[model samples]
Target: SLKKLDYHFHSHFSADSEELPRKHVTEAIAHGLEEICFTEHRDFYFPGMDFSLNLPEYFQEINQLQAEFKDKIKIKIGLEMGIDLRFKSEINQFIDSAPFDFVIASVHEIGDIEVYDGTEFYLQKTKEEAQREYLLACLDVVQNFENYNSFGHLDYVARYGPYTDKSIKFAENREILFEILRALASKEKALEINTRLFDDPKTEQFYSDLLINFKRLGGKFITLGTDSHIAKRDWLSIHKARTLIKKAGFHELATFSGMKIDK
Candidate 1:
């Protein structure tokens, strides 16, 4: 069996998910995952939704699950922090408050508007303008934050847009993308290969090129995540993603403990 691990996912602690933490653990074990991390959502000041996590309750539940499943598989506590320039201090404080195994820093909002929600962020801008702004925000977060272990979903903004072709062009966004990757590389942060959209051929090619670029820029760490909100939906994609990682010339997948990669 392949020694697979999923470094990102969500559980009930995330306001957007209703999956019990135990289900995620048991499901991963049954599917032969060696390890998994619960990266619950923690977006401070998210417009109407309360993306803030209940730290005490979350830690308590994960602690119990860790004890119960220690013999079967490794379960880690993590958070997917929605990076907003306005809440840098608050986000830093929250991360410091927890003994997190890993943290995935992601830019989910631009100027307080959620990227995945409808056409709000793309209302009055061309595809290039919107994506450039998003990449700049990513560059800002990667440059400023050092508390996270990985930058989740490099092309997250490409997932949604009113444009007919939504893929982020490596050539068009090369400068800003390089800036983001370089910042992460210098900080020793991993770049996550989010597998939710890997079914698309364009996405696969994009990641292949992105990974090669990252390596050329001295980036070493690579993290694989299904980014699944539900336990049963995309768990098996880990194997496929692992294959992609190796094909991209990486030999190891990053594993974290206490916000540091395990050696």
Candidate 2:
């Protein structure tokens, strides 16, 4: 059986979601989760729309939900920020001011191109080339940014690309990917195992290879997340991901409190 902690999920606070945190907490208890983290989106200058999380109101609800469910399950407040190095100072300020349990830095866009709807980007290059650029962008931010604790959705491009073959072949761009693994390992930051893509058998081996490389590079920390938008997806693929993580040689599961991993 998988451990009961889910490190990533969404709520009403994220612009892309309207699910209530309270309802998610209830669902987590029923799903048998011991802990759950609410990683709402904070994607500034996101292509057509800007996403700024309402921290004051968000924290208020998190506090209420935490207390309400303290006896049943553990609740955590986390934020997922879209990587844009230009916003470093402002983004750091926001993280410094909040009592976040976990901070995930992810590349949802590269210079104005969103990986999800980046038809123009894929049109300009082969599917392999474009997705390699996505990993390269994460390497850029991972080496430069220190405010985040984990890299969210490291192979997220595969989840939304238009290509039929969405496998992330490390051999395609091995060096840059190694640089990324090395950087995160040096910092002792975690590599997020986003469970959203685990259901696809073809893509399953893709992530397994990434995790194996991450472990081979001496990366010890592993954070698991379903990246769930609704309560239904809240604990999605946890059992499968756990088996993969263990197979990849990661023994510790990260749980957060007051913005740092709980010991």
What is candidate 1's lDDT per residue for 129-170, written digit by digit as tens?
988998888898887778789999988988897889888778
Instruction: Give candidate 2 regions above 4 Å deviation.
Output: 234-236
Clash pairs for candidate 1: none
lDDT of each: 0.85, 0.83
Model 1: weakest 10-residue lDDT segment is 233-242
* Segments of candidate 1 deviating more than 4 angstroms: none
The TM-score, computed over Cα atoms with residue i paired to residue i, of candidate 2 is 0.95
Clashes within 3 Å, all models in order: 0, 0
Task: Give the Cα-based TM-score of candidate 1 against the true structure.
Answer: 0.95
- Candidate 2 per-residue lDDT, tens place, 1-263, comes to 44578888898899988898888888888878888889999987788777888889999989988888889898888999887898888888888888898999999888887777545667757777887888889999988899888889877887776677776766777888889998999998999989887877755676687789988898988898889888886233678788888988877787777767788
